[PDB]
């Protein structure tokens, strides 16, 4: 690819769960009926060109398209196939994520990067097994 | 037509008498509900 | 003869109503065979 490109509003994004390789992507999810017309594009690995992406839009009128996304900027996300926003509904007396037309803000936050690399050093979230020096 | 559908879909506020999620957005329920208002009474529900 | 004098009673009803339009009617001259078995298992048995 290019190698550590930036991220801009309006770009066609691709996500991926970290520890499982199920690319969250445009799929034919036609199952959930809490709202009775809404989708839930879950997890499956069918990275197939057109039905691959989500797409960013800014939260409110403070940053327009073409601008570089900064840390902490709340966002709006939308499919290419369904065109639904990343809806945050309430199914039955509880939370339920769906895809609908009532948009919802969606913040982000940093976790790590490529320069923030281990090469033997410690990083949070890493599993490990403890050792004594003498007894092992 | 594409922009019309994309604009209708953000606010599909055709709220009929009673259905799930939206008001109506479903034809047989609202139509059979309104034929009771139409057939025996007048245009109104309570009318002679 | 049988089920169309019956449907002619229904046609006189729709004539006196002033030309309604409601689905619950099929006369026998052009009746699909889904509602004809209850008539068939006597109308063929008389002929047997």
């Amino acid at each position: 690819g290019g190698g550590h490109r930036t991220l801009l509003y309006g770009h066609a994004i691709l996500l991926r769960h970290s520890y499982s390789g199920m690319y969250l992507c445009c799929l034919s999810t036609s199952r959930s009926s809490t709202d009775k017309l809404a989708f839930d594009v879950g997890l499956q690995e069918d990275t197939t060109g057109e039905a691959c992406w989500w797409t960013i839009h800014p939260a409110s009128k403070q940053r327009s398209e073409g601008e570089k996304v900064q840390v902490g900027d709340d966002l709006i996300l939308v499919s290419v196939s369904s065109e639904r926003y990343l809806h945050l509904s309430y199914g039955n007396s509880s939370w339920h994520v769906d895809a609908a037309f009532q948009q919802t803000l969606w913040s982000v936050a940093p976790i790590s990067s490529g320069s923030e690399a281990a090469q033997g050093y410690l990083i949070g979230g890493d599993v490990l097994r403890l050792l004594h020096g003498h007894m092992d | 037509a594409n922009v019309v559908v994309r604009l209708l879909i953000r606010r599909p506020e055709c709220f009929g008498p009673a259905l799930r999620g939206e008001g109506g957005n479903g034809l047989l329920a609202a139509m059979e509900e309104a034929i009771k208002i139409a057939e025996d009474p007048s245009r109104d529900g309570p009318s002679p | 003869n049988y089920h169309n004098i019956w449907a002619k009673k229904k046609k006189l009803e729709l004539e006196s109503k002033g030309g309604g339009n409601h689905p619950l009617l099929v006369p026998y001259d052009t009746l699909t065979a889904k509602e004809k078995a209850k008539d068939r298992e006597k109308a063929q048995d008389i002929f047997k």
């Binding site: 369904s82 | 047989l28 139509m31 034929i35 | -």
Partner: peptide
């Protein structure tokens, strides 16, 4: 085959479109 399948699926999601056969007599 030309992006009309999106709007056709959106239309198809509103099935009641299969069930309007009842309304065609009612």
């Amino acid at each position: 085959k030309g992006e009309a399948i999106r709007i056709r699926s959106i239309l198809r999601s509103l099935g009641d479109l299969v069930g309007v056969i009842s309304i065609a007599f009612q």
